C-alpha cells in the first residue's frame with residue numbers, strides 16, 4: 001500500500017477505539033439507506049422500507065459486524081490485502097454477483113461513519129489515510145473478478 | 147495489468163503493424179475533437195476550432211508523434227511501466243497540471259483508432275489485451291501525482 | 293445537447309449500419325464482456341460463450357433500442373422511458389457500465405465503418421451514446 | 434430529483450450550518466486536496482498549505498454557492514447558471530472531481546453536526562450535492 005509508517009500509525013490507533021457493533025451496523029445501514037440500489041442484494045433481510053426499518057434490522061446490524069470484522073483483518077495484513085481478500089473476492093464475484101463499483105460506495109459510507117463517530121479526531125490527514133485503506137480494500141475485493 | 151503470455155504476444159504482434167507517426171496524429175487529434183475540454187492544455191497549438199483545423203494541424207501531428215513514441219517505449223517495458231514513466235508522470239503533474247483522468251480518455255480514443263485502422267483484425271480479445279495496457283499506462287502516468 | 297449537425301451525423305452513420313445493427317449489437321456486448329468482465333455480474337443467467345445465442349439475441353434487442361432512439365432523437369426521454377425504468381429501477385445497473393458499453397459500440401462501428409467513422413461522426417456518435425446513457429440512468433441510485 | 438422531503442432535510446441541515454458555512458467550506462477543500470491530490474491540478478495558482486488564506490477565502494465562496502442553491506432548491510439550473518458556465522466551459526473541471534468534493538462536504542458535516550447527520554438527512558444531502566454537481570457539469574465536453 002501507499003501507506004506511510006505515520007499513516008499506518010494513524011489508521012491503527014483510531015481503529016483501536018472503534019466500536020465494531022455500532023460502526024458495522026451503521027456503515028451497512030447507511031449504505032442501504034443512502035444508496036437504495038444496493039438493497040437488491042439483501043432481500044432476504046426483510047423490511048428495508050424506511051430508514052428506521054433498515055437501521056433497526058438485526059439481520060442488517062449483524063451482517064454489518066461480519067463486514068467490519070473482515071475489514072479489521074485487512075488492517076492486520078495491509079501488506080497483502082489481495083492475499084487477504086481473495087476468497088471473499090471470489091465469493092462476491094462467483095456467488096453474489098456484486099458489481100465492484102459498490103465496494104467504493106461502502107468505502108465512502110464507512111469514512112462518513114468514522115467521521116460521524118470521531119468528530120474532531122477524524123482530521124484531514126487521518127481521513128486521507130483511510131481513503132487509501134478503503135480504496136485498497138475495494139481494490140483487493142475486486143481482484144478475483146473475471 | 148494481468149498481461150498473459152498470449153495477451154503479451156497479441157499486443158506486440160499488432161503494434162508491429164502500427165505507423166506511429168500516423169496513429170499518434172489521429173489519436174491526439176481525435177481526442178481534441180471528441181473531448182474539446184482537453185484543448186485547454188494546447189492553447190499554443192493555434193487553430194483548433196474545427197475538425198480540419200485540429201486533424202490537419204501540424205503541431206498536433208508533431209505532438210501526436212511524441213506521445214505515441216513514449217507509448218512505444220512503454221510497450222517495450224510492460225514489466226516496468228511505473229519506472230519507465232516516472233519522469234513523464236512528474237511532468238504532467240508538476241509542470242502541466244493535467245488531471246490524470248485525461249489519460250483514460252486518450253487511452254480509449256487510442257483504442258478506437260486501432261479498431262478503425264485494423265478493422266476485423268482488431269478482435270474482442272485483442273481489444274481486451276489493449277484495454278489492460280492503456281489502463282496500465284494511465285495508472286503509470288498517474289503514479290507520481292502528489 | 294444534440295445539435296442539428298450531431299443528429300445528421302448519427303442519422304447518417306446509423307443509416308449505414310442498417311441490417312447489421314443486430315450483429316453489431318451482439319459484437320459490442322462480447323467486446324464488453326471480454327474487455328471489462330465486471331459487467332457480466334448483470335448477466336449471471338446468460339450463456340456468455342462465443343456465439344452464444346442469448347448474446348446474439350440480446351445484441352439485437354439493444355440494436356433495435358438504439359434505432360428507435362435515433363428515430364425519436366428529438367424525444368429520447370419519452371421514447372426510452374420504459375427502458376429507463378427497467379435499467380434504473382429493476383436491473384439497477386450502475387451508471388459506469390453505460391460508459392463501458394458505449395465505448396465498445398464506438399469500437400465496433402469503428403471496426404465496421406472505416407469510411408464513415410470520421411472525427412466528426414465519432415464526436416457525434418459519442419455525444420449521442422452519452423445521451424442515451426443519461427436517459428437510461430436518470431432515475432438511478 | 435429531490436422529493437419535498439429531501440428539500441426539507443437539506444433545509445434543516447444547512448440551517449444548522451449557519452455562520453460556520455465558510456469554515457466547513459474551507460475544511461472540505463483541505464480534506465479533498467489531502468485525500469484526492471489530483472484535484473489540486475485545478476488550483477496550481479493557490480497556496481494549498483495548511484490554513485492558507487486562499488483556501489480559506491475560497492472555502493467561503495463555495496459555501497455561499499451552496500447556501501444559494503439551498504435557497505433555490507427549486508430553481509437550481511437558473512440560480513447556478515453562472516457557476517455552471519465557469520465550471521463546465523471556463524475551468525473545464527472533469528466531472529469525477531465533483532464526487533470528490535461532495536464526499537468531503539459530507540465528511541465535514543458528519544464531523545461537525547453529529548446530531549443532525551442522520552441516515553435520512555445523509556441520503557438527502559447526497560442527492561442534493563449530486564444534483565448540484567449535475568447542474569455544474571451540465572455543459573461539459
Ligand code: HEM
Pocket residue numbers: 038041042044063066067070071088092096098102103106107137138141
Ligand atoms: C469492502 C467491502 C466489503 C466487505 C469487506 C465485505 C465482506 C463480506 C463478508 C465478510 C461477507 C460474509 C459472507 C460469508 O462469510 O459467507 C459478505 C457477504 C455478502 N456481501 Fe459483502 N462485503 C463488502 C461489500 C459488499 C457490498 C458493497 C455488497 C452489495 C452492495 C456486498 C454484498 C454481499 C452480500 C449480498 C453478502 C451475503 C449476505 C447474506 O449472506 O445474506 N458486499 N461480504
Ligand code: HEM
Pocket residue numbers: 184187188190212213214216217234237238242244248249252283287
Ligand atoms: C499516453 C498518455 C500520454 C503520454 C505517453 C504523453 C507523453 C508526453 C510527452 C512525451 C510529452 C513531452 C515531454 C516534454 O515536453 O518534456 C508530453 C507533453 C505534454 N502532454 Fe502528454 N502524454 C500523454 C497524455 C496527455 C494528455 C491526455 C494530456 C492532456 C489532455 C497531456 C498534456 C500534455 C501537454 C499539455 C504537454 C506539453 C505540450 C507542449 O506545450 O509542448 N498529455 N506528453
Ligand code: HEM
Pocket residue numbers: 331334335337353354357358375378379383385389390391393424425428
Ligand atoms: C446503450 C445502452 C443500453 C441500451 C440501449 C440497452 C437496452 C436494453 C434493452 C432493449 C433490453 C431488453 C429489455 C426488454 O425489452 O425485454 C435490455 C435489457 C437488459 N440490459 Fe440493457 N441496455 C443498455 C445498457 C445496459 C448496460 C450498460 C447493462 C449492464 C452492464 C445492461 C444490462 C441489461 C440487462 C441485465 C438486461 C436484462 C437481461 C435479460 O434479458 O435477462 N444494459 N437493455
Ligand code: HEM
Pocket residue numbers: 472475476491494495498499516520524526530531532534535565566569
Ligand atoms: C459542489 C460543487 C462546487 C461548488 C458549489 C463550487 C463553487 C465555486 C464558486 C462559488 C467559485 C468562485 C468563482 C468566483 O469567484 O465567482 C468556484 C470557482 C472555482 N471552482 Fe468550484 N465549485 C464546486 C466544485 C468544484 C470542483 C469539484 C472543482 C475542482 C476539482 C472546482 C474548481 C474550481 C476552481 C479551480 C475555481 C477557480 C478558483 C479561483 O480562481 O479562485 N470547483 N467554484
